[PDB]
Amino acid sequence: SEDCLGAFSRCSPKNDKCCPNYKCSSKDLWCKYKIW
């Protein structure tokens, strides 16, 4: 059982705790969708 964060959710660059396939930018300090 886990609870991840969605998109544009509050998060930090060091403690980035957002769902997978995402990214935490320090710019806005939120979650963003990223694909490699």
Side-chain angles (χ1 to χ4, degrees):
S1 173
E2 71 85 29
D3 290 61
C4 61
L5 284 165
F8 309 133
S9 283
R10 200 69 170 72
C11 73
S12 272
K14 210 155 172 73
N15 291 6
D16 159 38
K17 280 275 164 178
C18 301
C19 262
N21 224 287
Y22 284 103
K23 205 177 167 156
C24 200
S25 253
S26 54
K27 208 174 160 77
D28 266 79
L29 311 154
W30 58 7
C31 313
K32 296 220 68 214
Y33 71 92
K34 269 279 268 166
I35 49 180
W36 290 112

